Amino acid sequence: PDVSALQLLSNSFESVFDSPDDFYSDAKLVLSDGREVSFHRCVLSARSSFFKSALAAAKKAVKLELKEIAKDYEVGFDSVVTVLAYVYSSRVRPPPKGVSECADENCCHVACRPAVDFMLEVLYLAFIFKIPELITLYQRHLLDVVDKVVIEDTLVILKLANICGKACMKLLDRCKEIIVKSNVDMVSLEKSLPEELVKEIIDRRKELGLEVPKVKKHVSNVHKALDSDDIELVKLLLKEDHTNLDDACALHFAVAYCNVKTATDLLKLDLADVNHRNPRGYTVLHVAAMRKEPQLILSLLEKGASASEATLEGRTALMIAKQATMAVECNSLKGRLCVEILEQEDKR
Amino acid sequence: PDVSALQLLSNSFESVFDSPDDFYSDAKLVLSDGREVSFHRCVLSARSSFFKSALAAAKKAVKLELKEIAKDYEVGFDSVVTVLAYVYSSRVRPPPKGVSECADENCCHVACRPAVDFMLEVLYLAFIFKIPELITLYQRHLLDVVDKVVIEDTLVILKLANICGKACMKLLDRCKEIIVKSNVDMVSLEKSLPEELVKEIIDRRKELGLEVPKVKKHVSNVHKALDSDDIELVKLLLKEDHTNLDDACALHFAVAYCNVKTATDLLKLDLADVNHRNPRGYTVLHVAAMRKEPQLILSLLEKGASASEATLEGRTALMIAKQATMAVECNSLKGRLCVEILEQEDKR
Amino acid sequence: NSGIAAFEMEYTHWLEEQNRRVSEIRTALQAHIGDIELKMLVDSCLNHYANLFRMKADAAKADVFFLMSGMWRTSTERFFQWIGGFRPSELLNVVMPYVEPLTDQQLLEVRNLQQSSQQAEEALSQGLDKLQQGLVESIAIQIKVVGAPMASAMENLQALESFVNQADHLRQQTLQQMSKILTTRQAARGLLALGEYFHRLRALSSLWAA
Amino acid sequence: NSGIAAFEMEYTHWLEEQNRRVSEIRTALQAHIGDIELKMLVDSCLNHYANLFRMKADAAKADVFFLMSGMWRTSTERFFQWIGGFRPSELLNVVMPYVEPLTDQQLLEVRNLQQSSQQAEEALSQGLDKLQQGLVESIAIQIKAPMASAMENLQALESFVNQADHLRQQTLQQMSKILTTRQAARGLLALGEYFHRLRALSSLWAA
Ligand SMILES: CCCCCCCCCCCCCCCC(=O)O
Ligand SMILES: CCCCCCCCCCCCCCCC(=O)O
Ligand SMILES: [Zn+2]
Ligand SMILES: [Zn+2]
Structure with a gap:
């Protein structure tokens, strides 16, 4: 095989992708956020059979909504850029x-x-x-x-x-x-x-x-009562003395899967150990750092949450909150807010 | 580099070229014969600068006449097919x-x-x-x-x-x-x-x-007289006895470059040997076979021409007629007409 | 002057027909048409030049001075005029390279024609100079003096028209003898060259008059 | 050409005014009017000739070739027309019998002026011949830089036509300074009658 000719072909089509308006682009893939990627119908009709069938059906001024043909997993923009760059030049392009x-x-x-x-x-x-x-x-x-x-x-x-x-x-x-x-x-x-x-x-x-x-019956009742906002049913279930929030990891459940105000109310009841460890091996602070909700973290620290505890792998809540937030947010800014709250609290 | 992905890209583009209507072809190249080839604007705008400039000038359904851009040489169809195949896949397609x-x-x-x-x-x-x-x-x-x-x-x-x-x-x-x-x-x-x-x-x-x-002035005079299709002037020059048709090779000139009717009228005078040679070693019939003009060969065969004589390289008139015509015409039919005339004269 | 207006319209139509005949002879030569039609076209170019000379004689009877003035021709052509038209020896030199190749006999005949045309031109020029000096002298008489003046005027007008007639005769003779020396094809090439020469001169006049 | 039509009407009116001024100077000479009014009429004639030169300069810009041919003048004047007008030495010979008696100083001035005019005539004629031959040769070569040469030659021709007229005007003024009022008036009358006689002879050659 002639490697040089194929390399020049790949370079020419990569230069095509790098300046689509300069080489007569006839299609536009719009993402869920609103950004656009200009692509050519022939290249993607050749390399992708899905794109061939989709452009053949759309052609029955050409735009393809990515949020509709995918519709099963929200995909960012840099991943789309990487996929189209590989489609055009047959080489993977690292994201910014x-x-x-x-x-x-x-x-x-x-x-x-x-x-x-x-x-x-x-x-x-x-x-x-x-x-x-x-x-x-x-x-x-x-x-x-x-x-x-x-x-x-x-x-x-x-x-x-x-x-x-x-x-x-x-x-x-x-x-x-x-x-x-x-x-x-x-x-x-x-x-x-x-x-x-x-x-x-x-x-x-x-x-x-x-x-x-076997799933504990009373634990299942507590979990179902927690998913349905009804604090009076939770009080009724707790008044029977047959349940314990630490034995059910109710704080972990409320912080991971429930609403912010529900977890805030469960914490203000002051009926569960804040530094309690679940069967998985995580504390409530680690779950709060994973959930990325600042109100829960503030209420936990204001209630007596110890930040020096580590998980089974040795990560504290600060490293988890770091590894859970995107790097572009510290250069949605809800992650940056949690990161800055944890950094400010760590400074004291 | 990964050669496999490059070869898949090349195969996809070869499938594009093989059926350009199935991959949103947006431009056409029309030949001098009447035939036309469908092609894509992006691919040829990327692979060649000439097409980029021509399409950018035309844009200021796109048809490009090859007789206008390349005007000084009549190119065939298979040459265009080979060049476009190399443009689309970087692979030299052999000719039929x-x-x-x-x-x-x-x-x-x-x-x-x-x-x-x-x-x-x-x-x-x-x-x-x-x-x-x-x-x-x-x-x-x-x-x-x-x-x-x-x-x-x-x-x-x-x-x-x-x-x-x-x-x-x-x-x-x-x-x-x-x-x-x-x-x-x-x-x-x-x-x-x-x-x-x-x-x-x-x-x-x-x-x-x-x-x-150098060329003799009187020989140059007879040649210029033949170039102007003035047979009577050549007649008056031969009347002057300043030139001879044998030393001037007027038959070779008339058969090679001059008009057909002039050579016919020059032969109708019968004042020069038809089987005479030249410094290059060709007879009048050999040059007639090289030109592929049937009427000249016919008039030479009707007046007297030895077809069994060879050149300095060993080629006979039949060999020249066969090697001057392409195999498509025996599988403008002027070369085929000359070859069939000479094969008839063979067994005669 | 109705006669001069008529002359100018005839000359306009002559130029149009000259352009048409030159285009036809160019196309015919390029199409390698047969000797008979080409000879017909040559003899029609010759007839058209003859028609020009008749119209020039008509203008000469109406106003000989107008013909010598050359203002009915274009500006650059006036640089070459001789007694109401062009100098045949110069047009022969102009067209000679295009009627090439010439035979030895044709070459001798053309050079003889050129020599005879030159001698006739010199003799006509000397005669015209002598006439014009006599006109100066005779004119200088009537103005000083307050039967003979009219007769002298008429005789001198007849002499001027005669000189114009002789110059037109010389051009027509030279043209017809060139048309007889040369073959049909060669003559056609020469007429084409002459026509393109005149057209190029007119084009240059139009370019200098912009 | 609109310019040539305008020139021809202006020239018709110029001829009419010339005829009027000649009649007026004839009447003044015959009535033996005093030097002051006669000098005013002389100066009017000189101004009229100056106006002739102005219109000639304007017409030369429109079509110098038409002015060199002389088709704008009469039939008899063409035999005497030199580069768009008359030869001053010949008009001096024409007027010589009418200016006598001359003093020694006037005779010396006239002979000096005639010699200088003849030398200028010869030099300008030689320059025009050289110019004319060079255009003949260059056109012959071109048909058988070109634009610049065309423009240069055109400008040169214009300069020569305006120079010969400059010399004519200078010599005319020189006669107007050499001669007394009465002599100048007689000379202008002679010039006007000469021109009228030439035009009449042209009419006879055209009848
Ligand atoms: C067969 C003729 C070939 C060309 C001969 C050219 C030399 C003859 C010169 C005379 C041409 C007459 C045309 C000029 C007409 C005119 O002056 O009005
Ligand atoms: C007042 C002067 C008396 C002597 C006059 C001598 C001749 C003068 C020559 C100048 C004449 C001007 C007329 C030019 C006419 C023309 O250009 O057509
Ligand atoms: Zn990381
Ligand atoms: Zn072969």
């Missing part, structure tokens, strides 16, 4: 620094949440666009990375693997194995994963010999 | 059987007229389109084949090499040297090359001390 990097200067950005999110979005784009080489490349990257990612992000990775159909069998199997190997509570799974997925996971946990404890 | 092959079945079609003509057309197209790699590849081809091609075709190769300016400098130089080292008639140089090339070749020929005799 900050999109696939977290706000922790000690993090290598191999397994932190921004990098995982970018990889997930690009893989979903490659699946929707029907590009098998990019799908395999990023499936291998995610398989090499899931072992070092926090389990709460492994949940989202497994969600994407389930959405991406049979094109990610290896990723789906690895994620199911990692989840059933750990001691993840059923609550989160049922409130995040779909019904058939949680049922399959529970069936595999039962048949594989691994222990699957 | 018959185009690069002549009528002769005793030839390997490696240095015959149809092949050199196809190479010349493709090289001129690559020069007009400013694709330097294609230019270099076919310039290499022409230097490899030129050392075996008969001088008469090397004249046309030199003509196009000068048309390509300073880009095909190597082919030009080679052609020049070859022509200088050959005993080409002065009239052939005047009627095949512009004044600049003739003067340059004469200066180089005279600087090396080669045998470059």
